[PDB]
Design a protein around this nucleic acid. Structure first.
Ligand SMILES: [Mg+2]
Ligand SMILES: [Zn+2]
Ligand SMILES: [Zn+2]
Ligand SMILES: [Zn+2]
Ligand SMILES: [Zn+2]
Lengths: 56, 1179, 45, 56, 69, 159, 48
DNA sequence: CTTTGTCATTTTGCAGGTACTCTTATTCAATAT
RNA sequence: CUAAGAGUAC
DNA sequence: ATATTGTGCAAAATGACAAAG
């Protein structure tokens, strides 16, 4: 996570398998491949944090 | 063939290689080093020193008792038995490794030594020299001094002579190679430790700022002595432009750098001319004399041996010598500390002076720009300490400890007049516990990671682990792959992490010497004309070759060519041990012989004149190949012809990196030996236009290691891809041993249907890869099918998975003992009851029966109890609401892992060394491939499954064939994995024709020939096939590369990595979430994640992450002193800060608990971090 | 009591809590618990 | 550095990532188990009484 | 371990051709390709299913049974 | 199961055994049958019972499977035997003294639920052998016609 | 500073003892060091 | 006589980020109650 | 539980 | 019989020391 683009707010889509799924275009800012890479997910716990995550 | 003396072909050399691997095996170095240690090194360790003499003086106040006693204990021969185990009942029986593994014992054998206790008496007459005589009490009586762990398959192991049927009877896999120890039931392997060789003079240029420009140093050491390291350095003061260039030596136990001439005069060389002759061997080399004049001008003030000895003694750091005895002190330092590797005796001052002159000569040659500074990375200058020397030095230290203890006990008992008993003298626990601790934990003492848990994920993984070398980490560049690493360590096999280059792996045919006594070679040299060094005068013998043996300049020779010829002849006929290396540097006029241990060498074919054919030719011919073939076929009646027969008859030779400097090697016989329209598809090769070869490579493909030998067509790949595959094949899932069903390993993974590769190398049938494969031949299509295989994802056929592709068994073993907390506080395996047990786990105990163990066959899920154990406690305590005197037992059960589930495969009940019962429960489950599992080809083309399609949705060819896997085309161009494509083509051809593709690296197999064979079979020559879209049945506009390919299932599965945490256990100290998914931990929100959130500008989210999500603590402070020293009774609503004496100036703040802990730690360290809630200054 | 099998003999034994865990026939100290009697169900997929 | 500038947090997940051309640029696919583990606190309001009661 | 029941790719039953395959290799001294063709394995998926199999169960059968009746 | 193979290993192998399905339409799906777990209207019960009484390895084949349920006159259940020797699929192997006793319940299913229910194996499918519709663009180096072998169906259409 | 840091306060004469929260318990290393400090203090006081 | 700048030493603090698994070990021994 | 070490993933 | 005690930069800081007034 070398720059701010390597940490971005996404919209949840619940899917029936055991991996995080993301668009191919957004892999460049994350510098992410699919050869075993792992990624982390954080859930905001208040309306303020939720809102600024969605708006910034 | 028909002609017995016909030259061999490139195909014949594999027979030779087979013979080698018949005699040596894959782990020959481990077993050889351990056998050398047990056979000879133990006895040397025992005999060295280990004569405890205690001279109890008469101490006679009256002459009636003027008798001086002398009690000595000596150790004789040492006996090492077969491995045996004691027992709780005391019965001792033979122990087999597949009992030590199951019962957590140590595959160790007792050591006994013949102790001879002598006693002498003398009449204590003052002035008269004491004469000691025996009292006829020459008692002698082997005594048990400890246990030496035994490496499996060694000469002292039960399995050394076992046949295949015997191995099957003993529950031992015949494919198991040994070379490891069993410590407490764990398989431990000793990684070969790399170090710099001793007794070698190395000259180095120093940096500009330092006043010394060049330093010539030797790390002197003696193998048959105290084994102590004394570093002598010879330094040249002054930069190039400076005028006072004086050479000074750094003697041990001396506080100053003595000028060299003072040392030379101290040793006994007074005249300046003689010193200069000792240093410079040429009268015409006036440059060296000019550079050397300052030293003699410096030491002009001393012109006598006694004067120089006094000068050195004055500098002596001991500072406990009187003025007259300084000479003797200096003498002692020059006799037992200066150049120990030469000799510790006296009367060899000339030899040490000659060696010092040689070092100064080397330093001056480097300073005169006549030679480059010695390369620190040259692999011939390195040594590998294997199990032998490591255990040798460890046991030397530990036995020195034990004998010091013996001497202390004897002195104490004789002073206190108590009786003497050997059993109370020797504490075998010393040796036993020391060896067991050093092998059980990596730390080698009382370095780290010297002993490691043997890797058993895959057969190739174990093979690679058993041949691993580690280099502890100067101004060198050790990570680079040196030129001298050719043929000794794998060019491409090393971890990608911090260990890159430091951790190395042996080549297939590389071996480590175990060391031999150099006395026979010294006698040969003396007999064959080596002039002794004592009567050597350089002026009368200017062009004389200096002969070195193990770094000890033993003399000079005047006809080195004949001496080298006869030494080579002796070594080739077996008279000299083949491990001995002999190098002749013609330009430097030197002859070095090395016989010590740790040298890495490889075998090579010998090439001689062969006047009959008029040109150079290999000594090996078709007759020897025929005999080797006959012996191999008989093994699968004629005279046996083994690798040792080739060695003895002078057909093959052992060459190390040092000797490899002075030879010329032909890459292949058929193309480089004979004197000199070509296929454009073949690769370009150069004839070298030179015919003076001395050796020929047995096969170039033997430069690779165990893991790299699996790669098909490694010469058609980018080297980092080869390195990635070498690292990634150890994570391949296969069958690690055939007896996996009788081993209770912690974790084991097995393929249902291992398949041998369609494209296979010649070197992998010595690695048993076809017998224990670690992958499957999947039908792979390279296509942009659905976009779900982008960025290294893969599309796997769901129908193939349904039918058993890449399916796996997984076994996990949980161990549990009952321990004696006291003399009668034994733990008990049982089914704990909620009525009379404490802290019973929230899981179900219903699956345990009355012995506290689940019975094989029962399905177990996560958090269910599999081993029921309870421990007694003190009764008569009441708390917690439901704690009574009935609760005399605390639960100590073992639940199944939270995420894992399966069927209890097996449970094993036994007793430990202490006699207490313990159990091992092995649970079995099935891993079926799914989205997120990692698979890789043999070319570093790793990737996870993106999605799985059923057969009807996959693209299909005109024959109805659908791929098992679809990989993206974009993985090919950037990575340049051409070998992947070539191997797919070759596999298609082999599957069609029924043969096996020979994917060896340096063969003359071209894509043109494979394409022609494929065309003959009726397919497009380049592997393309017209495919049809699964969804619509229409032809795809593009044709698809399609064919079988060998893929490995890697150990990284998504179900072992998925982890989420809303709220859970908190760390006791910081009140923050615990670490790790095994503990339901939380994810680290590191510093730079905080930085990214700052850059985004989301302050509230950062606060929420750091406070509400981790640890929010409300604390009270007072407005007078900002400290948290406020007593707050919330129920009574009373706040008060003692000291300030206030009760209404209180505030509450929400700060991280880590912050409160930090402030309290500051206060405990006498700092007042006062916190104030209002500003006292303007911004 | 509960049934076990000698790791070497393959002989069947019945051991109680106080019984020492050894094979009566041969004295081997390694015993493997017997297969459960309750039926085990497996999906054939 | 280890406990104040950066610390372990709750309501976080981690796992392997996969590509999905059928997801929007700002969408992320979340495994059902992870979605069942991680939670958000929603305050009860007349506007969301019905669906929150249904979730309970 | 033991010969797979069906070919992974297409699903042709090849678990009943292992003994015939070994018999053809040993008794009739046919090379692998001709034996595979004789058994009816024409697609190279089936051919690799039978050609590359390693019969490890034989090794497993050498160890004495744990539970012997 | 005292064999050298895991229980689910053998269960997987057994699920892959082809069974006669001529009258499968007269069988019901277990999901829409009113029995509790399985009955005679929706399943066929087979039994395998093998023992290693011979000093040599004893091969457990699919011909050893015995139908225990009452087929009620249907033509389902019998394992399919194809080779000339009469032994079906090689289910397992037994050393002397090893035993394998087990009971299988067979329901009707389709290849979508699991590939073991697929009766189709491979299906060759081709059209337009001469590429007259130009649905493919032939990759080539020198000449596409020479480098692409003609399909066997080219004889059935006019070039 | 006259109020917050005087030089004579750089000399220790009363060591503050952090509460068990700072050195939670097998005792913590800080607890053992405090025990050693108390032992040395008592030894010096008795010798005086 | 004391600066004065000047080199040659001494300190001395640091050394990517997450994440997973396993293994061992918790002072040895002698003395006195 | 704690600590140390080793191996490993990106 | 068991508890108790005998590493390589590289900047900064510092010290030694020949020249200068
Ligand atoms: Mg990656
Ligand atoms: Zn206050
Ligand atoms: Zn027995
Ligand atoms: Zn097939
Ligand atoms: Zn029914």
């Amino acid at each position: 996570s070398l720059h701010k683009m390597s940490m971005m707010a996404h919209r949840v889509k619940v899917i029936p398998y055991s991996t995080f799924r993301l668009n191919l275009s957004v892999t460049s800012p994350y510098n992410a491949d699919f050869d075993g890479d792992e990624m982390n997910l954080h859930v905001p716990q208040s309306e303020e944090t939720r809102a600024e995550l969605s708006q910034l | 063939f028909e002609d017995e003396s016909a030259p061999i072909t490139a195909e014949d050399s594999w027979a030779v290689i087979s013979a080698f691997f018949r005699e040596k095996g894959l782990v020959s170095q481990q077993l050889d080093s351990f056998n050398q240690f047990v056979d000879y090194t133990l006895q040397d360790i025992i005999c060295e020193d280990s004569t405890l003499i205690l001279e109890q003086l008469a101490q006679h106040t009256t002459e009636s008792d003027n008798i001086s006693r002398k009690y000595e204990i000596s150790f004789g021969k040492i006996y090492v038995t077969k491995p045996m185990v004691n027992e709780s009942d005391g019965v001792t029986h033979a122990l087999y490794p597949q009992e030590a593994r199951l019962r957590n014992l140590t595959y160790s054998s007792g050591l006994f030594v013949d102790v001879k206790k002598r006693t002498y008496e003398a009449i204590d007459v003052p002035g008269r020299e004491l004469k000691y005589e025996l009292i006829a009490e020459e008692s002698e009586g082997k005594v048990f001094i400890g246990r030496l762990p035994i490496m499996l398959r060694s000469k002292n192991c039960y399995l050394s002579e076992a046949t295949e049927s015997d191995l099957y009877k003993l529950k031992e896999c015949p494919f198991d190679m040994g070379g490891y120890f069993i410590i407490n039931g764990s398989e431990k392997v000793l990684i070969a430790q790399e170090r710099s060789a001793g007794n070698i003079v190395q000259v180095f240029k120093k940096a500009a700022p330092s006043p010394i420009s060049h330093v010539a140093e030797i790390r002197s050491a003696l193998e048959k002595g105290s084994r102590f390291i004394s570093t002598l350095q010879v330094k040249l003061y002054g930069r190039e432009g400076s005028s006072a260039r004086t050479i000074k030596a750094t003697l041990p136990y001396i506080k100053q750098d003595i000028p060299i001439v003072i040392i030379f005069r101290a040793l006994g060389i007074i005249p300046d001319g003689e010193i200069l002759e000792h240093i410079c061997y040429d009268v015409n080399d006036w440059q060296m004399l000019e550079m050397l004049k300052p030293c003699v001008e410096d030491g002009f003030v001393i012109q006598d041996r006694e004067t120089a000895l006094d000068f050195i003694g004055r500098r002596g750091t001991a500072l406990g010598i009187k003025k007259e005895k300084r000479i003797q002190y200096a003498k002692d330092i020059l006799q037992k500390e200066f150049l120990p590797h030469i000799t510790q005796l006296e009367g060899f001052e000339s030899r040490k002076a000659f060696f010092l002159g040689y070092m100064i000569n080397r330093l001056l040659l480097c300073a005169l720009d006549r030679k480059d500074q010695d390369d620190r990375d040259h692999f011939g200058k390195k040594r590998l300490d294997l199990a032998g020397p490591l255990l040798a030095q460890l046991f030397k230290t530990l036995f020195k400890k034990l004998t010091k203890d013996i001497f202390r006990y004897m002195q104490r008992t004789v002073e206190e007049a108590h009786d003497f008993n050997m059993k109370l003298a020797i504490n075998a626990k010393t040796i036993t516990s020391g060896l067991k601790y050093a092998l059980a934990t990596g730390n080698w003492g009382e370095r780290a990671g010297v002993s490691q848990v043997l890797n058993r994920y895959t057969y190739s993984s174990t093979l690679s682990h058993l041949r691993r070398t580690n280099t502890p980490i100067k101004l060198a560049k050790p990570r680079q792959l040196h030129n001298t690493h050719w043929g000794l360590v794998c060019p491409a096999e090393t971890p990608e992490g911090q260990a890159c280059g430091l951790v190395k792996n042996l080549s297939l045919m590389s071996c480590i010497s175990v060391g031999t006594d150099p006395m026979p070679i010294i006698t040969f040299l003396s007999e064959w004309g080596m002039e002794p060094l004592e009567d050597y005068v350089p002026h009368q013998s200017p062009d004389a070759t200096r002969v070195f043996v193990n770094g000890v300049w033993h003399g000079v020779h005047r006809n080195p060519a004949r001496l080298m010829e006869t030494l080579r002849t002796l070594r080739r006929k077996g008279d000299i041990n083949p491990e001995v290396s002999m190098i002749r540097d013609i330009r430097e006029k030197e002859l070095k012989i090395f016989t010590d241990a740790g040298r890495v060498y490889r075998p090579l074919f010998i090439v001689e004149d062969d006047e009959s054919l008029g040109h150079k030719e290999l000594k090996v011919r078709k007759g020897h190949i025929a005999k080797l073939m006959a012996t191999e076929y008989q093994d699968i009646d004629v005279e046996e012809y083994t690798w040792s027969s080739l060695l003895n008859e002078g057909l093959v030779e052992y060459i190390d990196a040092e000797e490899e400097e002075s030879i010329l090697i032909a890459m292949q016989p058929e193309d480089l030996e004979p004197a000199e329209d070509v296929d454009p598809a073949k690769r370009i090769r150069v004839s070298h236009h030179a015919t003076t070869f001395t050796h020929c490579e047995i096969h170039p493909s033997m430069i690779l290691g165990v893991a790299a030998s699996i790669i098909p067509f490694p010469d058609h790949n980018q080297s980092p891809r080869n390195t990635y595959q070498s690292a990634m094949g150890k994570q391949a899932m296969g069958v690690f041993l055939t007896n996996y069903n009788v081993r209770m390993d912690t974790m084991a993974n097995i393929l249902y249907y291992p398949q041998k590769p369609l494209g296979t190398t010649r070197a992998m049938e010595y690695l048993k890869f076809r017998e224990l494969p670690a992958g499957q031949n999947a039908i792979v299509a390279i296509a942009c099918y659905s976009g779900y295989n982008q960025e290294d994802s893969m599309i796997m056929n769901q129908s193939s998975i349904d039918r058993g592709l890449f399916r796996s068994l997984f076994f996990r073993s949980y161990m549990d003992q009952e321990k004696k907390y006291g003399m009668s506080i034994t733990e008990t395996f049982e089914k704990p009851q909620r009525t009379n047990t404490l802290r019973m786990k929230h899981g179900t105990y219903d699956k345990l029966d009355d012995d506290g163990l689940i019975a094989p066959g029962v399905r177990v899920s996560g958090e269910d109890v599999i081993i029921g154990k309870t421990t007694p406690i003190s009764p008569d305590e009441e708390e917690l609401g439901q704690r009574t005197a009935y609760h005399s037992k605390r639960d100590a059960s073992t639940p199944l892992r939270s995420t894992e589930n399966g069927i209890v495969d097996q449970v094993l009940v036994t007793t430990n060394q202490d006699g207490l019962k313990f159990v091992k429960v092995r649970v079995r489950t099935t891993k079926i491939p799914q989205i997120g599992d990692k698979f890789a080809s043999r070319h570093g083309q790793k990737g996870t499954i993106g999605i799985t399609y059923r057969r009807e949705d996959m693209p299909f060819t005109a024959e109805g064939i659908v791929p098992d896997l679809i990989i993206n085309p974009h993985a090919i161009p950037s990575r340049m994995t051409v070998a992947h494509l070539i191997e797919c083509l070759l596999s298609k051809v082999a599957a069609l024709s029924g043969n096996e593709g020979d994917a060896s690296p340096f063969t003359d197999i071209t894509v043109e020939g494979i394409s022609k064979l494929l065309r003959e079979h009726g397919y497009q020559s380049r592997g393309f096939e017209v495919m049809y879209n699964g969804h619509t049945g229409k032809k795809l506009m593009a044709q698809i590369f399609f064919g079988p390919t060998y893929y490995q299932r890697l150990r990284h599965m998504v179900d072992d990595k998925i982890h989420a945490r809303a709220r859970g256990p908190m760390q006791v100290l910081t009140r923050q979430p615990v670490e790790g998914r095994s503990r339901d931990g939380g994810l680290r929100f590191g510093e730079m994640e905080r930085d990214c959130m700052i850059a985004h500008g989301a302050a509230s989210f950062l606060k929420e992450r750091l406070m509400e999500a981790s640890d929010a603590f409300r604390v009270h402070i007072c407005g007078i002193c900002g400290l948290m020293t406020v007593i707050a009774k919330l129920n009574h609503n009373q706040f008060e800060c003692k000291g300030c004496d206030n009760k209404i100036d209180i505030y509450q703040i929400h700060i991280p608990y880590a912050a409160k802990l930090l402030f309290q730690e500051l206060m405990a360290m006498n700092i007042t971090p006062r916190l104030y809630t209002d500003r006292s200054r303007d911004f | 009591t509960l049934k076990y099998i000698c790791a070497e003999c393959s002989s069947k034994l019945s051991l109680s809590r106080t019984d020492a865990v050894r094979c009566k026939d041969c004295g081997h100290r390694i015993l493997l618990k017997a297969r459960t009697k309750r039926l085990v169900q497996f999906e054939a997929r | 550095r280890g406990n104040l500038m950066g610390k372990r947090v709750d309501f976080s997940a981690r796992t392997v990532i996969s590509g999905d051309p059928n997801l929007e640029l700002d969408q992320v696919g979340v495994p059902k188990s992870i979605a069942k583990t991680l939670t958000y606190p929603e305050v009860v309001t007349p506007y969301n009484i019905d669906r929150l009661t249904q979730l309970v | 371990m033991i010969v797979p029941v069906r070919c992974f790719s297409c699903g042709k039953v090849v678990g009943d051709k292992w003994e015939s395959y070994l018999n053809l290799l040993q008794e009739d001294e046919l090379d692998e390709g001709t034996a595979l063709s004789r058994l009816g394995l024409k697609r190279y998926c089936c051919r690799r299913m039978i050609l590359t199999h390693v019969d490890l169960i034989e090794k497993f059968l050498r160890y004495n049974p744990l539970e012997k009746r | 199961n005292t064999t050298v193979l895991a229980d689910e290993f053998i269960a997987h192998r057994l699920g892959l055994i082809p069974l006669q399905s001529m009258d499968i339409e007269q069988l019901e799906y277990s999901r829409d049958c009113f029995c509790e777990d399985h009955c005679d209207k929706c399943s066929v019960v087979l039994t395998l019972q093998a023992f290693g009484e011979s000093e040599s390895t004893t091969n457990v084949y699919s011909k050893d499977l015995v139908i225990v349920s009452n087929l009620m006159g249907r033509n389902i259940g019998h394992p399919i035997i194809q080779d000339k020797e009469g032994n079906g699929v090689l289910i397992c192997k037994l050393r002397k003294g090893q035993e394998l006793k087990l009971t299988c319940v067979a329901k009707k299913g389709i290849a979508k639920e699991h590939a073991k229910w697929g009766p189709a194996a491979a299906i060759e499918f081709e059209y337009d052998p001469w590429n007259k519709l130009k649905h493919t663009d032939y990759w080539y180096e020198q000449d596409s016609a020479k480098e692409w072998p003609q399909s066997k169906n080219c004889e059935y259409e006019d070039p | 500073n006259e109020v917050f840091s005087r030089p004579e306060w750089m000399i220790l004469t009363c060591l503050p003892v952090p509460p068990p929260p700072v050195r939670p318990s097998g005792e913590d290393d800080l607890t053992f060091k405090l025990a050693d400090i108390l032992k040395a203090n008592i030894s010096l006081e008795t010798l005086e």
